[PDB]
Structures are given as structure tokens and as C-alpha cells.
Design an enzyme around this catalytic site. Structure first.
Site, PDB file in Angstrom:
ATOM      1  N   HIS A  61      23.696   6.601   1.836  1.00 23.89           N
ATOM      2  CA  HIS A  61      24.188   6.176   3.179  1.00 23.89           C
ATOM      3  C   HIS A  61      25.679   5.986   3.290  1.00 23.89           C
ATOM      4  O   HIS A  61      26.183   5.719   4.396  1.00 23.89           O
ATOM      5  CB  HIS A  61      23.542   4.942   3.694  1.00 23.89           C
ATOM      6  CG  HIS A  61      23.550   3.813   2.726  1.00 23.89           C
ATOM      7  ND1 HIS A  61      22.569   3.661   1.805  1.00 23.89           N
ATOM      8  CD2 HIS A  61      24.417   2.723   2.567  1.00 23.89           C
ATOM      9  CE1 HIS A  61      22.797   2.548   1.065  1.00 23.89           C
ATOM     10  NE2 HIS A  61      23.905   1.947   1.544  1.00 23.89           N
ATOM     11  N   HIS A  91      33.878   1.256   0.226  1.00 22.46           N
ATOM     12  CA  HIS A  91      33.131   2.328   0.844  1.00 22.46           C
ATOM     13  C   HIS A  91      33.602   2.375   2.252  1.00 22.46           C
ATOM     14  O   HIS A  91      34.379   1.512   2.635  1.00 22.46           O
ATOM     15  CB  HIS A  91      31.565   2.160   0.862  1.00 22.46           C
ATOM     16  CG  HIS A  91      31.127   0.881   1.503  1.00 22.46           C
ATOM     17  ND1 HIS A  91      31.118  -0.308   0.792  1.00 22.46           N
ATOM     18  CD2 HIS A  91      30.825   0.569   2.816  1.00 22.46           C
ATOM     19  CE1 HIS A  91      30.745  -1.293   1.629  1.00 22.46           C
ATOM     20  NE2 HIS A  91      30.524  -0.744   2.865  1.00 22.46           N
ATOM     21  N   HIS A  93      32.393   3.414   6.614  1.00 23.01           N
ATOM     22  CA  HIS A  93      31.422   3.690   7.662  1.00 23.01           C
ATOM     23  C   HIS A  93      32.132   4.559   8.662  1.00 23.01           C
ATOM     24  O   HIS A  93      33.306   4.274   8.950  1.00 23.01           O
ATOM     25  CB  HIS A  93      30.938   2.399   8.373  1.00 23.01           C
ATOM     26  CG  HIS A  93      30.319   1.429   7.432  1.00 23.01           C
ATOM     27  ND1 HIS A  93      28.955   1.366   7.229  1.00 23.01           N
ATOM     28  CD2 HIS A  93      30.914   0.556   6.534  1.00 23.01           C
ATOM     29  CE1 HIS A  93      28.724   0.359   6.354  1.00 23.01           C
ATOM     30  NE2 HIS A  93      29.958  -0.080   5.887  1.00 23.01           N
ATOM     31  N   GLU A 103      32.308  -0.516  12.401  1.00 22.82           N
ATOM     32  CA  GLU A 103      31.243  -1.511  12.533  1.00 22.82           C
ATOM     33  C   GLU A 103      31.780  -2.675  13.397  1.00 22.82           C
ATOM     34  O   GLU A 103      31.240  -2.944  14.486  1.00 22.82           O
ATOM     35  CB  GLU A 103      30.740  -2.022  11.173  1.00 22.82           C
ATOM     36  CG  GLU A 103      30.243  -0.817  10.325  1.00 22.82           C
ATOM     37  CD  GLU A 103      29.205  -1.242   9.383  1.00 22.82           C
ATOM     38  OE1 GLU A 103      29.547  -1.995   8.436  1.00 22.82           O
ATOM     39  OE2 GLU A 103      28.029  -0.822   9.614  1.00 22.82           O
ATOM     40  N   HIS A 116      35.530  -0.828   3.763  1.00 22.07           N
ATOM     41  CA  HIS A 116      35.117  -2.152   3.308  1.00 22.07           C
ATOM     42  C   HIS A 116      35.436  -2.255   1.852  1.00 22.07           C
ATOM     43  O   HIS A 116      34.897  -1.460   1.054  1.00 22.07           O
ATOM     44  CB  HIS A 116      33.616  -2.306   3.516  1.00 22.07           C
ATOM     45  CG  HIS A 116      33.273  -2.535   4.990  1.00 22.07           C
ATOM     46  ND1 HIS A 116      32.064  -2.305   5.510  1.00 22.07           N
ATOM     47  CD2 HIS A 116      34.075  -2.953   6.023  1.00 22.07           C
ATOM     48  CE1 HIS A 116      32.078  -2.607   6.840  1.00 22.07           C
ATOM     49  NE2 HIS A 116      33.318  -2.982   7.155  1.00 22.07           N
ATOM     50  N   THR A 195      26.366  -5.688   6.184  1.00 20.46           N
ATOM     51  CA  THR A 195      26.017  -4.968   7.397  1.00 20.46           C
ATOM     52  C   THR A 195      24.920  -3.884   7.170  1.00 20.46           C
ATOM     53  O   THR A 195      24.674  -3.129   8.111  1.00 20.46           O
ATOM     54  CB  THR A 195      27.241  -4.225   7.949  1.00 20.46           C
ATOM     55  OG1 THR A 195      27.633  -3.163   7.039  1.00 20.46           O
ATOM     56  CG2 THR A 195      28.380  -5.182   8.199  1.00 20.46           C
TER      57      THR A 195
HETATM   58  N1  V1F Z   1      28.855  -2.821   4.578  1.00 18.12           N
HETATM   59  S1  V1F Z   1      28.953  -4.170   3.529  1.00 18.12           S
HETATM   60  O1  V1F Z   1      30.372  -4.196   3.003  1.00 18.12           O
HETATM   61  O2  V1F Z   1      28.574  -5.435   4.220  1.00 18.12           O
HETATM   62  C1  V1F Z   1      27.746  -4.094   2.187  1.00 18.12           C
HETATM   63  C2  V1F Z   1      26.387  -4.192   2.514  1.00 18.12           C
HETATM   64  F1  V1F Z   1      26.022  -4.258   3.821  1.00 18.12           F
HETATM   65  C3  V1F Z   1      25.397  -4.173   1.555  1.00 18.12           C
HETATM   66  F2  V1F Z   1      24.098  -4.280   1.956  1.00 18.12           F
HETATM   67  C4  V1F Z   1      25.714  -4.073   0.191  1.00 18.12           C
HETATM   68  S2  V1F Z   1      24.285  -4.025  -0.923  1.00 18.12           S
HETATM   69  O3  V1F Z   1      24.735  -3.751  -2.379  1.00 18.12           O
HETATM   70  O4  V1F Z   1      23.528  -5.337  -1.133  1.00 18.12           O
HETATM   71  C5  V1F Z   1      23.135  -2.686  -0.412  1.00 18.12           C
HETATM   72  C6  V1F Z   1      23.606  -1.207  -0.521  1.00 18.12           C
HETATM   73  C7  V1F Z   1      24.951  -0.711  -0.050  1.00 18.12           C
HETATM   74  C8  V1F Z   1      25.794  -0.018  -0.961  1.00 18.12           C
HETATM   75  C9  V1F Z   1      27.055   0.475  -0.594  1.00 18.12           C
HETATM   76  C10 V1F Z   1      27.507   0.328   0.718  1.00 18.12           C
HETATM   77  C11 V1F Z   1      26.676  -0.378   1.630  1.00 18.12           C
HETATM   78  C12 V1F Z   1      25.411  -0.897   1.266  1.00 18.12           C
HETATM   79  C13 V1F Z   1      27.076  -3.993  -0.180  1.00 18.12           C
HETATM   80  N2  V1F Z   1      27.397  -3.901  -1.544  1.00 18.12           N
HETATM   81  C14 V1F Z   1      28.240  -2.830  -2.014  1.00 18.12           C
HETATM   82  C15 V1F Z   1      28.028  -2.705  -3.468  1.00 18.12           C
HETATM   83  C16 V1F Z   1      27.434  -1.547  -4.002  1.00 18.12           C
HETATM   84  C17 V1F Z   1      27.231  -1.464  -5.374  1.00 18.12           C
HETATM   85  C18 V1F Z   1      27.652  -2.509  -6.223  1.00 18.12           C
HETATM   86  C19 V1F Z   1      28.282  -3.643  -5.699  1.00 18.12           C
HETATM   87  C20 V1F Z   1      28.468  -3.750  -4.306  1.00 18.12           C
HETATM   88  C21 V1F Z   1      28.057  -4.045   0.823  1.00 18.12           C
HETATM   89  F3  V1F Z   1      29.334  -4.006   0.536  1.00 18.12           F
HETATM   90 ZN    ZN Z   2      30.286  -1.609   4.654  1.00 19.47          ZN
END
Ligand code: V1F
Ligand code: ZN
EC number: 4.2.1.1
Length: 257
Positions: A61, A91, A93, A103, A116, A195
Site C-alpha cells: 500500500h 513513506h 501517500h 491525508e 510521513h 492513518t
Molecule cells: N500513515 S502512518 O504514518 O500513520 C502509519 C500507519 F498508519 C500505520 F498503520 C503503520 S503500521 O506499521 O502499524 C501498519 C502498516 C503500514 C506500513 C507502512 C506505511 C503505512 C502503514 C505505520 N508504521 C510504519 C512502519 C512500517 C514498518 C516498520 C515500522 C513502522 C505508520 F507509519
Molecule cells: Zn502514512
């Protein structure tokens, strides 16, 4: 199973993650007029000189750039934060078109994308324990508009063809995230959440007021990524943003003016 489509997008997430309708969800619209200037806020401290990148990953994603967070290297502190938060990953969006993608919104304005930079509170020892805490994460949000290229983003853009599909990764060392920051660190801050699922209410959001400019060719390359894995029908990775959520009983604070 969750994603960004008609059948599994943001409007469906609550069924598997009831916290989607919770009391401190993100993102939010930042109403610049009602954000209160808080003269008690500090200047943000972003210390990325020692940052060590490891890998870049298409996780189905977004794409993540990951850092070695096993020592005290790249840290965010000051600002609204009472502690030391360690950079783990960044990362983006983004949208299918330049008119959408971010966002957070600013007086309902949508930017083309949003970066982010995710950090975890070193009092909780690791990321997985930090997300279970209401002050466990600090996420620095930086808006992208389309204009002049960002020289400091090009190394990221150039490697994307190598992680086109879900679950692909690539070595990504010596990337300096200081090259993705705007000139001003003036910011808005509020208590919110991840998010994407699991939507945990663990984030101090710090959103910079000054967007960075990226070129149309740079953002076009983000839009060539795929949500699907290799060998599946191509679904372009676009519009992987959650819309603004109700502010509820929260105050957005400004570091400036
Ligand atoms: N968009 S965000 O910055 O609030 C966000 C999330 F919403 C989120 F759900 C996560 S997560 O790790 O619990 C779920 C998956 C994910 C992964 C990358 C981007 C968005 C969502 C991270 N965590 C980022 C992360 C990934 C791997 C290791 C450590 C942190 C995250 F950074
Ligand atoms: Zn994010």
C-alpha cells in the site's frame, strides 16, 4: 484484506478495526484559523545527520524506506514532544492526480502527496511496544506540491522500478532524509492515530506548514507502482490516502504566528 478500493477502502475499515470511529483518529483537516498559537511549544529538533537507511520496500500500500533504529542515531525531539523519538521509516501517500493525495488537509486544501517520517518513543524500547502507548509515536508530516523537482528525492524515485509490486524490496543505503525537508520547521501539532489499519491511537502528529516541491515526473513515477503482487492484474498504486476524520474533542496547536 483492507486497502484503498470501493470494496475495501477507508469507509470499510471500521468493520475489522472499530477504532476507526474512535476519539482521536487521523488524518484531520487543519483549520488554520482556529489552530491556536502556543507560545509554550518548542522549536522542533530534527537530528538526521547519523541516519542509516537499510532497505526500500513495496508493502502493497505504499513504499517504505527503513532505517536502522538499533542505536541512537536519527532522532526527533523538542516541538511538543516530552521525549526522544527514534526514526524507523518513512513513506508517502499520494494521488491519481495532482489535485489530491495528501491525508491531512489545510483549510480543506489537498496536496499532491504527503511524506510521513515515523519515529518511536525510546522510553518504550521498540516500535512494537510504542504503538501500544498513547505517546508512543511521533510522525512528522510534510506536504508535497508539484512544481520544481526535489533533488533529494531523486534517489528514491530512481529505485522504484525495482520494487514495482507488493513484497518487492531493494537495498537502499546511504539515503539522507535531510534532503526531503523544507526550509521552515513551523508546524501544527495534535494527538491522533496511525492513518492505516490498525489505526492505533498512538501518534503525536507534527505537520509542517511549508510544503516541499516535487516535479510532475517525480510524482508520476510514484503512480507507476502497483498495489498487486507480481503476476496479478495490475492495479496502479494511487490514492492510498485516508480522508480527513472528525476532529472531535481535540485542539490543533501552532508553533508559529
Ligand atoms: N500513515 S502512518 O504514518 O500513520 C502509519 C500507519 F498508519 C500505520 F498503520 C503503520 S503500521 O506499521 O502499524 C501498519 C502498516 C503500514 C506500513 C507502512 C506505511 C503505512 C502503514 C505505520 N508504521 C510504519 C512502519 C512500517 C514498518 C516498520 C515500522 C513502522 C505508520 F507509519
Ligand atoms: Zn502514512
Amino acid at each position: 484484506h483492507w486497502g484503498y478500493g470501493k470494496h475495501n477502502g477507508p469507509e470499510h475499515w471500521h468493520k475489522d478495526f472499530p477504532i476507526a470511529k474512535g476519539e482521536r483518529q487521523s488524518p484531520v483537516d487543519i483549520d488554520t484559523h482556529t489552530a491556536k498559537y502556543d507560545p509554550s511549544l518548542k522549536p522542533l529538533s530534527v537530528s538526521y545527520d547519523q541516519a542509516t537507511s537499510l532497505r526500500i520496500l513495496n508493502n502493497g500500500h505504499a513504499f517504505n524506506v527503513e532505517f536502522d533504529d538499533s542505536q541512537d542515531k536519527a532522532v526527533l525531539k523538542g516541538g511538543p514532544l516530552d521525549g526522544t523519538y527514534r526514526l524507523i521509516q518513512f513513506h508517502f501517500h499520494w494521488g491519481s492526480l495532482d489535485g489530491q493525495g495528501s491525508e491531512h488537509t489545510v483549510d480543506k486544501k489537498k496536496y499532491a502527496a504527503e511524506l510521513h517520517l515515523v519515529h518511536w518513543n525510546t522510553k518504550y524500547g521498540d516500535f512494537g511496544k510504542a504503538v501500544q502507548q498513547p505517546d508512543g509515536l511521533a510522525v512528522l508530516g510534510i506536504f508535497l506540491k508539484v512544481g520544481s523537482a526535489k533533488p533529494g528525492l531523486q534517489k528514491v524515485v530512481d529505485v522504484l522500478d525495482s520494487i514495482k509490486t507488493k513484497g518487492k524490496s531493494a537495498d537502499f543505503t546511504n539515503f539522507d532524509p535531510r534532503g526531503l525537508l523544507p526550509e521552515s520547521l513551523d508546524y501544527w501539532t495534535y494527538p491522533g492515530s496511525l492513518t492505516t489499519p490498525p489505526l492505533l491511537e498512538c501518534v503525536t502528529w507534527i505537520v509542517l506548514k511549508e510544503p516541499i516541491s516535487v516535479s510532475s515526473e517525480q510524482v508520476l513515477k510514484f503512480r507507476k507502482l502497483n498495489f498487486n503482487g507480481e503476476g496479478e492484474p495490475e492495479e496502479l498504486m494511487v490514492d492510498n490516502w485516508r480522508p480527513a476524520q472528525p476532529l472531535k474533542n481535540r485542539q490543533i496547536k501552532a508553533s508559529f504566528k
